[PDB]
Ligand binder design. Structure first.
Ligand code: HEC
Ligand code: HEC
Ligand SMILES: [Zn+2]
Ligand SMILES: [Zn+2]
Lengths: 136, 137
């Protein structure tokens, strides 16, 4: 029922990054520089294959500072986590959703079984609820 | 001088950090855009406080970006910059060989001066083995 903290995620495949700045509709709460990481099982799904149970995607979100026309990574605000289990997480479409405040394992953020998170990712039904595309 | 090898499979490597450089920054030409730093296993050793062993490779992956309603989105790859550790072969440039690959393509070598220009700026970081990037969590 609970999503595992994705230990060692920092050494996974870096899928992409995006910057969300003040004025963007998702500034709350996704404002900052974010990086998406995928484990080996997730990569198979991302490649065009299907997602094996045990596939994990991580949204790693940082605050940034402006420094003379550079945006520089500040403090980690949170990690978001999607964990593939077709049977266990079938209520939110095969992915378990969890947020860890400041990336800390103890600071689980999701209180509704991940309904809130799913509600937005459900628009991406046709690509198994993942927004991120693999690039070169 | 001998040539820096193209770092095949660098995209699978450990993502050290990212930074955005916008118009007006000192490094706009030629480093403007979103860049990500990648390190092979041997480079991680040096980053974590060991010596950099020969074979250590750092990559600067530079993308253009588009600004679209207060989001910055990665566009096309502009270039990669490469540092390859070999204390013998790259002695003239402090043990690192420096190269640029236009659009990240192996044929599109950008360095014409044996990496002297790259080295000149990297030299300020003598104390940390000529590397700027620091490992973060
Ligand atoms: C819209 C209002 C969203 C809500 C609420 C949540 N997420 Fe989401 N997520 C959203 C977008 C537009 C993207 C892509 C960002 C990009 O850089 O392209 C994401 C991405 C993720 C990822 C990375 C994998 C992917 O699908 O691309 C993860 C791990 C993720 N999201 C998890 C997550 C969790 C745990 C949420 C509730 C706490 C959550 N998301 C809500 C849009 C929205
Ligand atoms: C002056 C400023 C320069 C010049 C002329 C070059 N580089 Fe280097 N470089 C510079 C900075 C301030 C940084 C850090 C970016 C960050 O903190 O995110 C870098 C980084 C690199 C990297 C990543 C490794 C590292 O942090 O040291 C590589 C692989 C790299 N630079 C290579 C490189 C090459 C091949 C150059 C000449 C074509 C070159 N640089 C020039 C600062 C400067
Ligand atoms: Zn200015
Ligand atoms: Zn703007």
């Amino acid at each position: 029922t609970k999503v595992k903290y994705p230990d060692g995620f920092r050494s996974w495949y870096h899928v992409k990054s995006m910057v969300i700045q003040p004025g963007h509709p998702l500034e709350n709460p996704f404002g900052g520089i974010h990086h998406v990481y995928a484990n080996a099982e997730a990569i198979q799904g991302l490649r065009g294959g299907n997602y094996p149970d045990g596939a994990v995607l991580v949204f790693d979100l940082f605050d940034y500072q402006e420094d003379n026309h550079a945006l520089v990574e500040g403090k980690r605000k949170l990690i978001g986590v999607m964990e593939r289990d077709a049977k266990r997480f079938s209520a939110t479409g095969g992915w378990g959703y969890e947020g860890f405040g400041e990336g800390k394992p103890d600071k689980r953020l999701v209180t509704d079984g991940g309904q809130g998170c799913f509600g937005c990712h459900a628009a991406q039904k046709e690509s198994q609820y993942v927004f991120s595309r693999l690039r070169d």
